[PDB]
PDB file of C-alpha atoms in Angstrom:
ATOM      1  CA  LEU A   1       0.000   0.000   0.000  1.00 37.65           C
ATOM      2  CA  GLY A   2       3.129   2.242   0.204  1.00 37.02           C
ATOM      3  CA  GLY A   3       1.998   4.902  -2.360  1.00 38.82           C
ATOM      4  CA  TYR A   4      -1.518   4.278  -3.793  1.00 40.31           C
ATOM      5  CA  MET A   5      -4.977   5.930  -3.536  1.00 38.59           C
ATOM      6  CA  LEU A   6      -8.699   5.045  -3.366  1.00 39.08           C
ATOM      7  CA  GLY A   7     -10.174   7.275  -6.086  1.00 39.03           C
ATOM      8  CA  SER A   8     -13.806   6.141  -6.649  1.00 38.53           C
ATOM      9  CA  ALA A   9     -16.308   3.344  -6.077  1.00 38.34           C
ATOM     10  CA  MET A  10     -18.111   2.197  -9.225  1.00 35.88           C
ATOM     11  CA  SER A  11     -21.013   0.428  -7.464  1.00 34.38           C
ATOM     12  CA  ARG A  12     -21.101  -3.418  -7.806  1.00 36.87           C
ATOM     13  CA  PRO A  13     -20.987  -4.399 -11.527  1.00 37.17           C
ATOM     14  CA  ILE A  14     -22.704  -7.496 -12.927  1.00 33.94           C
ATOM     15  CA  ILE A  15     -20.543  -9.617 -15.266  1.00 34.69           C
ATOM     16  CA  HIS A  16     -22.496 -12.505 -16.868  1.00 30.06           C
ATOM     17  CA  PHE A  17     -19.900 -15.327 -16.857  1.00 28.58           C
ATOM     18  CA  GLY A  18     -21.970 -17.552 -19.187  1.00 27.78           C
ATOM     19  CA  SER A  19     -23.444 -19.975 -16.603  1.00 27.47           C
ATOM     20  CA  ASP A  20     -26.801 -19.332 -14.796  1.00 26.33           C
ATOM     21  CA  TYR A  21     -25.175 -21.071 -11.809  1.00 27.42           C
ATOM     22  CA  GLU A  22     -22.246 -18.602 -11.501  1.00 28.21           C
ATOM     23  CA  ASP A  23     -24.703 -15.770 -12.294  1.00 24.17           C
ATOM     24  CA  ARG A  24     -26.644 -16.677  -9.078  1.00 25.44           C
ATOM     25  CA  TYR A  25     -23.513 -17.601  -7.049  1.00 28.48           C
ATOM     26  CA  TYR A  26     -22.114 -14.080  -7.579  1.00 28.82           C
ATOM     27  CA  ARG A  27     -25.516 -12.325  -7.180  1.00 29.29           C
ATOM     28  CA  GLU A  28     -25.889 -13.931  -3.723  1.00 30.51           C
ATOM     29  CA  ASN A  29     -22.320 -13.714  -2.459  1.00 30.26           C
ATOM     30  CA  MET A  30     -21.171 -10.473  -4.152  1.00 29.87           C
ATOM     31  CA  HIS A  31     -20.745  -8.500  -0.911  1.00 33.31           C
ATOM     32  CA  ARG A  32     -17.541 -10.362   0.143  1.00 32.99           C
ATOM     33  CA  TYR A  33     -16.087  -9.061  -3.194  1.00 36.98           C
ATOM     34  CA  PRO A  34     -15.010  -5.346  -3.545  1.00 34.32           C
ATOM     35  CA  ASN A  35     -16.890  -2.177  -4.633  1.00 36.41           C
ATOM     36  CA  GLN A  36     -13.728   0.027  -4.843  1.00 35.06           C
ATOM     37  CA  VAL A  37     -10.209  -0.691  -6.193  1.00 33.18           C
ATOM     38  CA  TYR A  38      -6.931   0.973  -5.190  1.00 35.94           C
ATOM     39  CA  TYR A  39      -4.639   2.306  -7.967  1.00 34.03           C
ATOM     40  CA  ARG A  40      -1.686   4.639  -8.831  1.00 36.74           C
ATOM     41  CA  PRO A  41      -1.220   7.503 -11.347  1.00 37.66           C
ATOM     42  CA  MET A  42       0.435   6.701 -14.731  1.00 36.18           C
ATOM     43  CA  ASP A  43       4.057   5.764 -13.965  1.00 36.24           C
ATOM     44  CA  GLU A  44       5.257   3.425 -16.706  1.00 35.88           C
ATOM     45  CA  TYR A  45       3.277   0.269 -17.694  1.00 34.01           C
ATOM     46  CA  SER A  46       0.240   2.266 -19.012  1.00 32.52           C
ATOM     47  CA  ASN A  47      -1.454   0.956 -22.196  1.00 34.35           C
ATOM     48  CA  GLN A  48      -3.765  -2.144 -22.377  1.00 32.50           C
ATOM     49  CA  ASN A  49      -3.887  -4.711 -19.502  1.00 31.16           C
ATOM     50  CA  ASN A  50      -0.511  -3.663 -17.950  1.00 30.94           C
ATOM     51  CA  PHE A  51      -1.876  -1.003 -15.563  1.00 27.47           C
ATOM     52  CA  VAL A  52      -5.108  -2.904 -14.909  1.00 26.65           C
ATOM     53  CA  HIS A  53      -3.404  -6.184 -13.900  1.00 28.25           C
ATOM     54  CA  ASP A  54      -1.170  -4.413 -11.352  1.00 31.20           C
ATOM     55  CA  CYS A  55      -4.013  -2.590  -9.575  1.00 31.07           C
ATOM     56  CA  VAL A  56      -6.139  -5.772  -9.925  1.00 30.59           C
ATOM     57  CA  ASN A  57      -3.547  -7.894  -8.157  1.00 34.75           C
ATOM     58  CA  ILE A  58      -3.178  -5.306  -5.362  1.00 35.78           C
ATOM     59  CA  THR A  59      -6.954  -5.194  -4.752  1.00 41.05           C
ATOM     60  CA  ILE A  60      -7.377  -9.000  -5.034  1.00 41.26           C
ATOM     61  CA  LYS A  61      -4.451  -9.167  -2.527  1.00 40.19           C
ATOM     62  CA  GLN A  62      -6.176  -6.568  -0.321  1.00 37.82           C
ATOM     63  CA  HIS A  63      -9.268  -8.846  -0.263  1.00 35.80           C
ATOM     64  CA  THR A  64      -7.035 -11.937   0.341  1.00 36.02           C
ATOM     65  CA  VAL A  65      -5.344 -10.101   3.275  1.00 36.36           C
ATOM     66  CA  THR A  66      -8.660  -8.769   4.726  1.00 38.82           C
ATOM     67  CA  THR A  67      -9.828 -12.409   4.840  1.00 40.92           C
ATOM     68  CA  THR A  68      -6.541 -13.860   6.236  1.00 41.03           C
ATOM     69  CA  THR A  69      -7.551 -11.427   9.029  1.00 41.00           C
ATOM     70  CA  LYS A  70     -11.134 -12.783   9.456  1.00 43.36           C
ATOM     71  CA  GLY A  71      -9.968 -16.446   9.160  1.00 44.71           C
ATOM     72  CA  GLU A  72     -10.876 -17.263   5.556  1.00 46.58           C
ATOM     73  CA  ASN A  73      -9.278 -17.654   2.122  1.00 45.73           C
ATOM     74  CA  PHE A  74     -11.005 -16.897  -1.181  1.00 45.83           C
ATOM     75  CA  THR A  75     -10.876 -20.152  -3.151  1.00 46.19           C
ATOM     76  CA  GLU A  76      -9.619 -19.682  -6.738  1.00 48.28           C
ATOM     77  CA  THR A  77     -13.189 -19.574  -8.172  1.00 41.31           C
ATOM     78  CA  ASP A  78     -14.040 -16.615  -5.867  1.00 42.07           C
ATOM     79  CA  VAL A  79     -10.675 -15.047  -6.812  1.00 40.84           C
ATOM     80  CA  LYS A  80     -11.444 -15.412 -10.581  1.00 40.53           C
ATOM     81  CA  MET A  81     -14.950 -13.946  -9.940  1.00 41.17           C
ATOM     82  CA  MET A  82     -13.233 -11.054  -8.074  1.00 41.12           C
ATOM     83  CA  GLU A  83     -10.743 -10.594 -10.966  1.00 39.02           C
ATOM     84  CA  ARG A  84     -13.652 -10.082 -13.410  1.00 39.01           C
ATOM     85  CA  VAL A  85     -14.992  -7.360 -11.094  1.00 41.71           C
ATOM     86  CA  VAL A  86     -11.689  -5.720 -10.025  1.00 41.86           C
ATOM     87  CA  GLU A  87     -10.600  -5.529 -13.734  1.00 43.82           C
ATOM     88  CA  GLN A  88     -13.936  -3.963 -14.818  1.00 43.47           C
ATOM     89  CA  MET A  89     -13.451  -1.293 -12.124  1.00 42.03           C
ATOM     90  CA  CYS A  90      -9.784  -0.549 -12.970  1.00 42.95           C
ATOM     91  CA  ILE A  91     -10.526  -0.309 -16.741  1.00 43.60           C
ATOM     92  CA  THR A  92     -13.092   2.399 -15.796  1.00 44.40           C
ATOM     93  CA  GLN A  93     -10.353   4.151 -13.737  1.00 43.72           C
ATOM     94  CA  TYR A  94      -8.001   4.065 -16.800  1.00 41.48           C
ATOM     95  CA  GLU A  95     -10.931   5.575 -18.803  1.00 39.38           C
ATOM     96  CA  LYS A  96     -10.723   8.782 -16.646  1.00 39.45           C
ATOM     97  CA  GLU A  97      -7.294  10.441 -16.121  1.00 36.88           C
ATOM     98  CA  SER A  98      -5.475   8.463 -18.857  1.00 36.36           C
ATOM     99  CA  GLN A  99      -8.104   9.580 -21.422  1.00 35.94           C
ATOM    100  CA  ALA A 100      -7.396  13.221 -20.479  1.00 39.71           C
ATOM    101  CA  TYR A 101      -3.620  12.456 -20.643  1.00 38.33           C
ATOM    102  CA  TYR A 102      -4.286  11.159 -24.212  1.00 32.60           C
ATOM    103  CA  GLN A 103      -6.493  14.130 -25.199  1.00 31.80           C
ATOM    104  CA  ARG A 104      -4.125  17.130 -25.697  1.00 31.25           C
TER     105      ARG A 104
END
């Protein structure tokens, strides 16, 4: 966390995996997953998935670590469901300042 920020929530997205089962599983148990993602300003690694994967892994880690506190682990399914969400948020965060940076 040594030099990041918490810039916006972007509610709780819905991301239709392609299985009615997962689509319920998430819609029940979404609250354990995030509604905000940490990130940094553009300092290298800023184009397609580069920036997104870095902030994703931090926020998926922050969830991991919040649940090593409570006495849980997110199994890899929950983690992959989180990654869908945490990516969708961070892509939106790229689509703010970086789009002004590439405006001129």
